[PDB]
Write a protein that binds this ligand. Structure first.
Ligand SMILES: [Mg+2]
Ligand SMILES: [Mg+2]
Ligand SMILES: [Mg+2]
Ligand SMILES: [Mg+2]
Ligand SMILES: [Mg+2]
Ligand SMILES: [Mg+2]
Ligand SMILES: [Zn+2]
Lengths: 242, 148, 295, 166, 153, 110, 133
């Protein structure tokens, strides 16, 4: 609910907090590359996909401007090495949610990412497996954001990745909810990684997970679910749309 | 108090003593301090007696640990799976000795009210009483007033 | 074919199971489906369920238990659906009660179920020596003072007609059948493997051929409770125990040229509508006469 | 104070090995500091034990007690939390496992009398607890038949022994 | 002992209960449907019913008139009695009134409450109970007995 | 009189856990053919009676609008109308009440 | 199983109600007028008057009280008692009751079937009278 009673309780006095809140991350993902609607059929052809990716990387002006600010700010930096570390950060992140070790899970993933992947899952059993990457990780684009307040530059490297994963979610009573551990399901993830620049500890992190518009509807859940109609008061009549 | 506790009938462990008697005590673990006065008696016992006691009884293992402990203790354990705890705390050599010999001769069975002194299987040799036993039968096995 | 009464049972049942797990072996792997609720009561209502697994009964459990005590039959589209009959495609569901304004669908289904019960009670109430060939379940309207079932019996058995003792035994075992609460289960078969179930009962196989004749796909509608399986037209009530007052009223022998066939007359009522004693008795008096509508 | 009951819903089990019986759902839910008395409360919470939750709400609804409404809301809450926060199909598949009242922390006041005597008065508060279990309501217990009692009697005559006999 | 007593004792005494019924009757005759305490309403019903048979005695009859004078507090109401209420009741001797029991009051005192009404008022129909329809399996089972009581006569 | 001895929790139990003191299960509970809510067999449905009550109230307001005094009440029978309706000859010559809502499901035209 | 409270009149439509009523009342008139004729049915042996005898009694309905006079001039009040329906119900032989006198069960005025209990209506349907108060 968005509610304020201004009739009595006044207005919370406007403060200058002695410490400006220090954020490791900015929540927003600035520019979302929207992948080609034919990326399922171009994924079976190796030198179609790999060629289009590498081509759109070299050709984009924004991409190489951002990789220029990253490179000029942070020496010993390479874009051909990155999808390796990125595909690693994944297999560490999910392997963390298995064991539920949240201390390493902070070192890896970003401020915006943690609340989501941790939240609704924290009372259940998570068992997830990494078997094949059918297409090796592809770097899609890079975006820099200039805060003229802080001089703080946030690099965000987008990695589009194809994967083979086995996920089993048990509910807190010990019974299975979502999907088998025996199906190494094929997944296409559009992933976003972020780094703070001015930071001396320069960590590379998982920022967000984006799903493209045409992306396949996910596995059918086990339990039946009821969507209620609107709750009616006594004098309110129902109305049915066509 | 009788109605307070459990009970057990009188019994043998694994029918011990019938075929061959088997000392039921398995192991003993002494824990004392080389330094503390509390263990004083139990130190002397460890010196002089333990050795010979061991020879007295092949069947039992004896684990003796000096450790920084303030209350000297001996723990009997039995083939019965039973365990008994003891303090040797501040006792003479004579005292300790007598106590270890107590442990030596026990069932391992628990000390509880023992309902009656005699365990007997089939006490009833030559018969066990039933009502009819002393009653004379009649001809035809008739009732008191039955006629034929 | 030398065969025991128990062996017949084991056969029909095991075949039925093979059929069931064949309907299951279509490999649906839990496809989601959707139902909307057209009922007067809870509008705008939606059930996302498991295709060919979830039932219109299991739909009522998202609403309340009230529906489950109350509802005998479910109208999906324009069709009566039995409560445990798993749904096929995405549809719209209404629920139906004994106390609703136009029960006639429900009423029919009740008479149906009722008859099927009695048929089973009859079959296993006769000596292993004699032969009971069960025939069919003639469908009368409700204003007919009873429900009916057709039975042919062994030729040396032809002379007798029952005593209220025997009838009362039928009734006793009927209630003993109500007591144990048995679900009514529905399977849909091709005639080819349906006929293999019945076999020895001739009139049965005939009825199967007729029924699968008027339906393009050779479709046979099979109903099962416990050990017993019968083919009938239309849906059945969800639970055995909905029936309260139950009876085998009279039996009346009737004979075609080619057969000697006894008709069983009986009368019964659900827990919900249950009749007072005097009333019950009067209905039990009208239930005595021959009631004939086969066409 | 003590809050224990609530935290029983945080307990996360080890996953089930296949082939084993699927463990039924369990939900602990309770309201604290109700203006009702402990005892009057008791009767209500005794009324609903064993029932299917819809049955429960049926009874609860029409009763005249103050507590009726309140227990009622707790049951609705419990139901919806059960299906939402834990995984349960079929929200009418529940029954009441355990339903009870504790006494809360009591306020203290004067109750005047006359001739200036005064009683000390207690403004009352109370807690309501319920644990809901998914499943069909456990079958109510029938009185023993004569066939039971006789069996007992005999079992006993045949438990007998001559005592002090050895 | 109450044996054969026809009146419940309400309010401060005899006279009090009468003025109580005065208000109730006034309200009934103005608003045509009222809800109130079950006993008070059940009681009132007799008075409501006979007032209408005074109304039926015409505007001219003196007894009837001062009767309605006393029994209707707002004097405005006396015409509605004779001109409106009494003429729309002709055919029916005693069937003036519907009294039904409403769910207990939602105040803390929780009384047993009813609603009382003049048939053929213009107001939303009270959601009365209906008998089961004649398609019900039971009634249907009785129509057989019915038609075979016709067919043997 | 003054109680001579504190009573036991046992004795207190058997007094106030006695079956006569217990709240009994009401078995006349049913559901509303209309709104599928609950009502005891012999009593009106609270909810349906509520739709009713509200409508009645609104009507009474709108007939307090057509009346310009505490004491002024018509000498004719009255009838109520809804959006898109007209007085019939049978019903003309009566006081009319013109309301905004469309004629509800349960309420009949009569 | 939560099995509901049921009386007779519950599910009867407006139509069947008076039908039930007429059906019952009619079978009542039939039932009473049938045994209206005792002596030709199967009358049990009539026995002579023995000196130590005890006659059967009756069941009545207290009507009112009324004054009535004697030829002598004194005044009385008397009770108006009305038999309405008096029909003997069952018979217990001498030894099955008191071991002394045999007992004769007797019924009172007639009432509604609807409000009595199964056991009883069964007993009456095996006799063929309507229910007694
Ligand atoms: Mg003073
Ligand atoms: Mg003083
Ligand atoms: Mg006190
Ligand atoms: Mg009285
Ligand atoms: Mg008073
Ligand atoms: Mg009265
Ligand atoms: Zn309603």
């Amino acid at each position: 609910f968005v509610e304020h009673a201004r009739k009595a309780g006044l207005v919370i006095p406007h403060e200058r907090l002695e410490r400006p809140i220090h954020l490791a991350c900015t929540a927003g993902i600035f520019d979302a590359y929207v992948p080609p609607e034919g990326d399922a059929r171009i994924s079976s052809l190796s030198k179609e996909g790999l060629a289009q990716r590498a081509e759109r990387l070299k050709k984009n002006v924004a991409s190489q401007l951002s990789i220029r600010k990253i490179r000029e700010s942070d020496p010993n930096f390479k874009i051909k090495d990155f999808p390796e570390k990125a595909k690693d950060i994944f297999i560490e992140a999910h392997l963390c949610l298995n064991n539920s070790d949240h201390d390493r899970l902070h070192t890896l993933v970003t401020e915006n990412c943690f609340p989501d992947m941790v939240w609704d899952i924290r009372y259940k059993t998570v068992r997830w497996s990494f078997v094949e990457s059918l297409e090796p990780p592809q770097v899609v684009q890079v975006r820099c954001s200039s805060l003229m307040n802080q001089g703080n530059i946030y690099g965000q490297v987008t990695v589009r990745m194809h994967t083979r994963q086995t996920l089993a979610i048990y509910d807190r009573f010990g019974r299975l909810m979502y999907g088998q551990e025996d199906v190494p399901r094929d997944v296409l993830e559009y992933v976003v990684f972020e780094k703070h620049l001015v930071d001396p500890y320069g960590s590379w992190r998982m920022h967000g997970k984006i799903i493209p518009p045409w992306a396949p509807p996910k596995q059918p859940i086990l339990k039946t679910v009821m969507i209620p109609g609107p709750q009616l008061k006594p004098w309110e009549e129902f109305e049915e749309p066509q | 108090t009788a109605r307070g506790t459990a009970s057990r009938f009188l019994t043998s462990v694994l029918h011990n003593g019938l075929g061959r008697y088997v000392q039921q005590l398995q192991r003993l673990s002494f824990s004392l301090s080389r330094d503390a006065p509390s263990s004083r008696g139990a130190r002397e016992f460890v010196e002089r007696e333990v050795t010979d006691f061991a020879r007295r009884n092949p069947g039992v293992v004896i684990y003796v640990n000096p450790r920084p402990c303030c209350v000297p203790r001996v723990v009997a354990e039995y083939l019965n799976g039973a365990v008994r705890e003891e303090s040797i705390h501040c006792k003479s050599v004579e005292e300790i000795a007598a106590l270890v010999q107590k442990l030596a001769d026990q069932s391992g069975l628990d000390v509880i009210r023992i309902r009656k002194p005699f365990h007997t299987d089939s006490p009833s040799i030559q018969g066990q009483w039933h009502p009819f036993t002393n009653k004379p039968t009649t001809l035809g096995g008739l009732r008191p007033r039955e006629v034929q | 074919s030398q065969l025991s009464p128990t062996e017949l049972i084991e056969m029909q049942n095991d075949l039925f199971n093979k059929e069931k797990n064949r309907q299951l072996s279509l490999t649906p792997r839990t496809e989601k489906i959707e139902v909307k609720h057209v009922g007067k009561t809870d509008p705008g209502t939606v059930f996302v369920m498991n295709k060919n697994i979830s039932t219109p009964y299991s739909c009522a459990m998202h609403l309340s238990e009230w529906y489950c005590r109350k509802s005998i039959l479910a109208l999906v589209d324009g069709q009566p659906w039995d409560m445990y009959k798993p749904l096929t495609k995405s549809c719209e569901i209404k629920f139906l009660t004994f106390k609703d304004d136009d029960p006639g669908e429900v009423n029919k289904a009740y008479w149906r179920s009722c008859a099927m019960m009695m048929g089973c009670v009859i079959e296993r109430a006769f000596k292993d020596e004699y032969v009971v060939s069960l025939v069919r379940a003639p469908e009368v309207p409700v204003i007919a003072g009873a429900f009916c079932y057709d039975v042919v019996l062994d030729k040396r058995l032809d002379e007798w007609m029952p005593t209220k003792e025997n009838l009362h035994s039928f009734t006793k075992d009927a209630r003993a059948l109500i007591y144990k609460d048995l679900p009514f289960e529905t399977l849909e078969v091709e005639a080819k493997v349906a006929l293999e179930i019945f076999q020895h009962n001739k009139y049965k196989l005939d009825f199967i051929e007729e029924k699968a004749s008027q339906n393009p796909e050779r479709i046979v509608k099979l109903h099962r409770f416990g050990d017993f399986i019968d083919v009938s037209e239309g849906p059945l009530i969800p639970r055995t125990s909905i029936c309260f007052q139950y009876e085998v009223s009279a039996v009346h022998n009737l004979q075609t040229q080619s057969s000697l066939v006894r008709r069983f007359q009986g009368l019964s009522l659900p827990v919900h509508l249950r009749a007072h004693f005097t009333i019950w008795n009067k209905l039990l008096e009208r239930s005595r006469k021959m009631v004939t509508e086969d066409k | 104070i003590s809050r224990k009951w609530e935290k029983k819903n945080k307990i996360v089990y080890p996953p089930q090995l296949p082939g084993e019986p699927r463990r039924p759902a369990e939900i602990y839910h309770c309201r604290r500091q109700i203006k009702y008395s402990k005892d009057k409360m008791w009767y209500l919470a005794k009324l609903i034990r064993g029932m299917s939750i819809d049955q429960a709400l049926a009874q609860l609804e029409f009763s005249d007690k103050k507590g009726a409404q309140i227990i009622k809301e707790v049951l609705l809450e419990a139901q919806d939390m059960a299906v939402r926060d834990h995984n349960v199909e079929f929200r009418s598949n529940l029954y009441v496992a355990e339903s009870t009242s504790g006494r809360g922390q009591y306020l203290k006041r004067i109750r005047y009398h006359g001739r200036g005597r005064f009683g000390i008065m207690e403004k009352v508060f109370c807690h309501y607890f319920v644990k809901l279990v998914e499943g069909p309501p456990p079958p109510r217990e029938a009185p023993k038949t004569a066939v039971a009692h006789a069996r007992e009697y005999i079992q006993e005559l045949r438990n007998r022994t001559i005592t002090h006999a050895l | 002992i109450s044996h054969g007593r026809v009146f419940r004792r309400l309010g401060l005494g005899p006279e009090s209960r009468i003025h109580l019924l005065q208000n109730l009757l006034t309200g009934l005759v103005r608003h045509e449907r009222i809800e109130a305490s079950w006993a008070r309403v059940d009681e009132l019903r007799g008075y409501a019913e006979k007032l209408i048979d005074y109304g039926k005695l015409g505007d001219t009859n003196e007894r009837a008139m001062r009767m309605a004078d006393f029994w209707l507090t707002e004097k405005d109401l006396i015409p509605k009695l004779f001109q409106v209420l009494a003429p729309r009741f002709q055919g029916q001797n005693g069937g003036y009134t519907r009294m039904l029991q409403i769910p207990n009051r939602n105040e803390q005192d929780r009384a047993k409450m009813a609603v009382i009404e003049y048939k053929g008022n213009c107001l939303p129909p009270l959601p009365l109970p209906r008998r089961d329809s004649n398609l019900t399996l039971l009634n249907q089972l009785l129509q057989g007995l019915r038609q075979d009581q016709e067919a043997s006569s | 009189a003054a109680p001579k001895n504190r009573r036991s929790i046992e004795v207190n139990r058997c007094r106030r856990r006695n079956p006569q003191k217990l709240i009994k299960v009401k078995n006349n509970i049913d559901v509303c053919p209309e709104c599928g809510h609950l009502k005891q067999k012999h009593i009106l449905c609270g909810y349906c009676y509520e739709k009713v009550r509200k409508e009645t109230a609104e009507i009474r307001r709108q007939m307090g609008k057509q009346e310009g005094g505490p004491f002024r009440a018509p000498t004719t029978e009255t009838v109520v109308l809804y959006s898109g309706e007209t007085p019939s000859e049978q019903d003309q010559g009566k006081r009319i009440i013109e309301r905004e809502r469309k004629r509800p499901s349960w309420f009949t035209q009569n | 199983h939560g099995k509901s409270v049921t009386w007779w009149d519950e599910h009867l439509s407006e139509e069947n109600v008076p039908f039930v009523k007429q059906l019952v009342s009619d079978e009542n008139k039939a039932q009473l007028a049938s045994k209206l004729c005792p002596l030709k049915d199967e009358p049990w042996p009539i026995h002579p008057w023995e000196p130590g005898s005890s006659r059967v009694g009756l069941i009545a309905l207290k009507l009112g009280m009324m004054p009535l006079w004697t030829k002598d001039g004194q005044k009385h009040v008397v009770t108006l008692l009305q038999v309405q329906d008096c029909h003997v119900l069952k018979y217990t032989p001498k030894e099955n009751h008191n071991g002394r006198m045999a007992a004769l069960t007797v019924g009172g005025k007639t009432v509604s079937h609807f409000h009595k209990s199964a056991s009883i209506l069964e007993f009456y349907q095996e006799l063929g009278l309507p229910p007694k108060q």
